[PDB]
C-alpha cells in the first residue's frame, strides 16, 4: 500500500483468501470489514499516528484521549471472488467540532469498476471515563493537513441511506439470537471486542434461509457502548419490508442495556 | 505465491495484518493456523485439486470421498509482528494405506532463520457416511507425483513432540469454558466449522493470566468429530506440569468427544 500522489489519501490492494469466503465462493461483509479496518491503519501509520485503532497524536496519549466509531455504513455491489484482487482507497476528513469521517471507495483490480462504497462516523472520547468531547483546534490542526479540504464523499447522494436516522427495535423481536460471548480472537491488540465482531453478531440474528437466497447489498450500524471481554449479547432482528429490510438490535443479555442498533437491505441472488 | 523448481512443494510469503495480531502486537496461533491452511489451498490449486479444503480428485469426487485432518501439530519460536514478511514453505507426502502428512516450515523473510515449523496427519472419509477408508491404488497414484519421494520431514527427531499419544482428560477438568457456539464467520465455504475455530476454543479455557505472562510454544490437536453449526462446546483444561495443559472439547448435552490436545507455553 501507499498514499497517493497528492498525500490526501491512500490505496492498497488484498488478494482474496481461501478462508476468507462465505458459501458463495466470494468474500463475506466481515472480511470486507477487516480489509476496510487494514487499510485504515495502514492509512494512520504512513502519516505518523497511533496504530491501535485509536489514531492518536502524542498531544491525544497525554490526555488520554481517542477516536471511537459512532456510525459504519457500507454498500456492496459485488464481493470479491476467492483469489480476486480488490484495490480499497481510503481518506479522511473533518467534521468541524463533531468528529472526524472515514471513507472508502472498493474496485475490482482488472476491470476498475467500483464494487462497493464505506463511510464512518467518528468522535472523539477519552478513553477511562468514556466522556465524549468536541474536538480542540490544536488536536484538529494535528489531522488537517493529512485530509482533502474540498468536501469529496464516498456519498454524495441527496437522500443517500449513509444519514438515516436508525429506531430502536420493539419487543418482541421477529428472529433473535441469544448468548453471544466474544472469544480472544474477537479482540484487537488493546483486548477490547473488534467493532467486526458486531457486524458478525448482528448478522446472526439474520435467519439462514435469508442468507441462503439474498445477497447483503447495504449495512449501517450505529454503535452506543462497547461490549467487555466478559459480556453477554443478544442480537434481535424484525422485518421492515425483490428486496428484504431488517431492523437490528444488539443489547446485554442480562439488564438489556443497548450496545448497537442498525439497519440492513438484501437483494435476491 | 508460486511451486517450488522441482514442483514438488510450495512458497508463499504474507504481511501480517493489524486485526491478525494480540496482545503482544504479534500474530496469534490462530492467524498462523489460517495462513498454514491458506498455502494448503494455494499448493492444492496450482496442482489441479479442489481448493475446499478436501483436494479431491474426479476420481475422489464421483465417489463421494475426502480428504480430513485427523492430527495438527504446530511449533512456534518466534511469532511474527505486524508488518512483518512470513514466508511458508509447504509440502505433502503420503504416508501409505494409513492417509497423508503435509508439512510446513515458517520463516521470517528478513533474516531467513525458521520461526516455526507443523505438520498434520490426513485420512480418507466417505464425506456422506462419514466411514474412514484405508486409501485405494487409483487415488494413491493422482497425488504420488505432486510428493516428494525420500522423507523429507519438518519433525526429523525420533519419538518427537508430534507424534505422542494424547490421553483423556478425567473429570473434574481444572478449568472450563462453557457454551461456546460458532457464528458464521466460523464456517467454511461449505458451512463446514473451520478447524481453526476449534483451536481458539481449546485457548478458550486457559487462564487469561497464563495468557498474559506466557507465550504458546507448542499445540498438538487430535480431531475425532466435527462440530455441526448448530452443536454447543465445553471446553476443558487441566495443568499437567515451562507450563503444559492437557485439553478437551466436548458436546455440551451428551459429552461426546469432539477433539482433544497439550499445548506447551514457555514464561516470558
Ligand atoms: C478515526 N479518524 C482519525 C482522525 C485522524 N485520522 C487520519 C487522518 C488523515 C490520515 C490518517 C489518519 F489516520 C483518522 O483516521
Ligand atoms: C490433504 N492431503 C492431500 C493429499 C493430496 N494433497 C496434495 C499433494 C501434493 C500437492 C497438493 C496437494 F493438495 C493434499 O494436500
Request: contains cysteine.
Amino acid at each position: 500500500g501507499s498514499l497517493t500522489e497528492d498525500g490526501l489519501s491512500y490505496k492498497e490492494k488484498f488478494v482474496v483468501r481461501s478462508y476468507e469466503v462465505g458459501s458463495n465462493k466470494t468474500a463475506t461483509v466481515e472480511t470486507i470489514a477487516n480489509l476496510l479496518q487494514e487499510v485504515g491503519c495502514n492509512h494512520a501509520q504512513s502519516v505518523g499516528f497511533s496504530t491501535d485503532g485509536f489514531a492518536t497524536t502524542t498531544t491525544m496519549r497525554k490526555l488520554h484521549l481517542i477516536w471511537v466509531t459512532a456510525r459504519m455504513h457500507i454498500e456492496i455491489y459485488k464481493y470479491p471472488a476467492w483469489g480476486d484482487v480488490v484495490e480499497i482507497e481510503t481518506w479522511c476528513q473533518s467534521e468541524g467540532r463533531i468528529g472526524t469521517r472515514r471513507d472508502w471507495i472498493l474496485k475490482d483490480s482488472v476491470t476498475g469498476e467500483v464494487t462497493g462504497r464505506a463511510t464512518s462516523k467518528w468522535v472523539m472520547m477519552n478513553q477511562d471515563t468514556r466522556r465524549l468531547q468536541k474536538v480542540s483546534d490544536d488536536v484538529r490542526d494535528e489531522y488537517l493537513v493529512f485530509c482533502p479540504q474540498e468536501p469529496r464523499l464516498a456519498f454524495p447522494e441527496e437522500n443517500n441511506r449513509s444519514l438515516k436516522k436508525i429506531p430502536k427495535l420493539e419487543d418482541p423481536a421477529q428472529y433473535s439470537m441469544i448468548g453471544l460471548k466474544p472469544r480472544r480472537a474477537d479482540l484487537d491488540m488493546n483486548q477490547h471486542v473488534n467493532n467486526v465482531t458486531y457486524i458478525g453478531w448482528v448478522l446472526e440474528s439474520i435467519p439462514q434461509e435469508i442468507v441462503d437466497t439474498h445477497e447483503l447489498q447495504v449495512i449501517t450500524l450505529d454503535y452506543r457502548r462497547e461490549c467487555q471481554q466478559d459480556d453477554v449479547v443478544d442480537s434481535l432482528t424484525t422485518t421492515t419490508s425483490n428486496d428484504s429490510q431488517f431492523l437490528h438490535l444488539l443489547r446485554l443479555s442480562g439488564d438489556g442495556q443497548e450496545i448497537n442498533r442498525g439497519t440492513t437491505l438484501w437483494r435476491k441472488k
